[model samples]
Target: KKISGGSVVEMQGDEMTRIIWELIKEKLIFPYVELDLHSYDLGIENRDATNDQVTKDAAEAIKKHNVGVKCATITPDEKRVEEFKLKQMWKSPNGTIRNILGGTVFREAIICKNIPRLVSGWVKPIIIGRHAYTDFVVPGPGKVEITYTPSDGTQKVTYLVHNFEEGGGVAMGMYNQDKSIEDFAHSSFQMALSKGWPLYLSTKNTILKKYDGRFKDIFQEIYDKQYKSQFEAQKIWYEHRLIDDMVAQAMKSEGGFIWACKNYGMMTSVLVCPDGKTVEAEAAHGTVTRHYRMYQKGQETSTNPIASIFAWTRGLAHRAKLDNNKELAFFANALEEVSIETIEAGFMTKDLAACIKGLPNVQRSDYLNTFEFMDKLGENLKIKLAQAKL
Candidate 1:
């Protein structure tokens, strides 16, 4: 029998990320919470074997279960294709899942006081939102051939540019319907409302009138029509800013609001799932392929594991919210505090050590290895939980 609250779709992935994915659970997770987990092997070989049906199934699992924590997987390139020797070069699992789910990807930097950051004056956290999915999900150039079926029983629209072309050249056809824009708008508003931070949509409307201007129009129209009152009542606001101005302004600002883009940027610790009902959180970095290679040669590696550990807490915290499990949420919070405090208390992995100093200035004593750091985090988490109880 499984634990009763809510289950997680644990999509195991490739490279160094895959190694720590299990290690984090073994060290910090399973010992504390007896969770009912729905596991999916989203590793490159497994994905290729199933012809990416596994990826689709995993996305569906997240939809049904309402939460997931994924390990970073390889989005195959030419080199990766050669290494894996796949049946075909599959698209990014993240891209496929996002296409099906259709929500913004939000990325927040994990801040530690002792951890040097470029934005030292950034008092509040910066959360970036990517409202569009352009390059990654959509096939481009020679990689694409499309056929669009009509809803009524008419002829289909088709294109295969290579059949007549001498060499591959760029081909483009794209438009965003009102609902698509609305979905993006709704997600942005929800992001702002959730964080209780101001929201800004940056667009190049000043130059591209009807094109980029449409995004501005739809967002402003929707905010005025639906979200303005809620935002005002919530004591937060939404505004449209010019792309250039927003980028420049953001450079000097304290940055607590959601910067919703037309399409996207990046991800790791935070996720708000499509339909606004769940959160799918995971590590922000990819499989430590380069680092893992060194490990195979019996070299000591000091890979940073904070993001991966946060993946555990973030997803569980969301589940705790859904189940209204206060204890679980408290545990997630305490663990997060421990993760940050662990660094500030003068302990961190090698990556963070390098960030704190020049590479040559850094020393082995400056940070802990993967297992040592995880053990430290685990020790501190238990301490925090105990203190909370006391």
Candidate 2:
């Protein structure tokens, strides 16, 4: 019997990921779960055709549904605009969705037992939670200043940011709302608590004393006031680290902590709203343009679809949590485990096989093509689910 009682916002995207998305549903998801699916086509053509209203509508649908699983979409550049022959240069669908959603994006790499990591010490996953609301500006040979005008008719305050000399320099003026920072803290704390892992907020507070210090201060205040006791009960704690030190620490340490970053940066990404109830999961990578080009030539390709598959598992796991559906939860966990187990069993695509064996040494017989890999996972899932039933 298919597991039911959950509604999911399913977002379709572009190119290779779009292709794998259909196969994921047909092979892995559709047979096991009965979802009240709200499908939105966020493909570039659709977004352009609808004047990008589809992306806005999809964001709104996610707000309503509380869970969204997305495929990797093309954030068109000038080249893509020319290739797609668009009406106008469209903004990134992810940026648009996040602007509407108002959340911190967390990225955690999917770890397979046999896949060798560049950082050998990282046995577990180090989740990165990035504060998404920030901007950077390029300055000419001129002075840059920021003014704060009070709505209550108070005196205007002005501060000189930097003075660019003859050789113009780049300057970034970042301002985070108190409410948004608090929301970021809440989301980070919620993520850490859920994972039963320690959370560290990283910032360059020593140099950017006022700017980055504010982030450190806010996280500490929130953790002390709100999450401290709960964290202690779970034997997990929250702390602030200098960004440089944190990076060094991460390099030497085995993974299993949430590092909260003040800027952009990850694999399986989940945009967790401040409410901690709503989440939109998507692969951290982009549209597989290279693979799509190869596929267009009718060439055999072995692209990795793990992160896209993870988008489903992570989103559905949240749905299972919201509905308190134990069976659905078990299925989600089982699928995740099976995916990893399949990789460990030496059934993987070119990317992963290259991770274990050098890319130059990788042979056709050593790995499966994209279609074969998905079919292998589907075959394994059937065996796993059957065993689970018995």
My TM-score estimates for the predictions, one after another, are 0.82, 0.89
Candidate 1 C-alpha lDDT tens digits along 9-53: 898988788888888888777877888889999999999999999
Q: lDDT tens digits, residues 70-152, model 2?
A: 99888778898998999998898989999889888898988877877779899889898877643456656888888899999
Q: What TM-score does structure 2 among the candidates reach?
A: 0.89
C-alpha lDDT of candidate 1 relative to the true structure: 0.79
Clashing pairs in 1: 130-263, 130-264, 131-263, 132-262, 132-263, 268-284
Error of 2 at 348 (Å): 1.1
- Local accuracy by lDDT, each model: 0.79, 0.87
lDDT of 2: 0.87
Clash numbers, per candidate: 6, 0
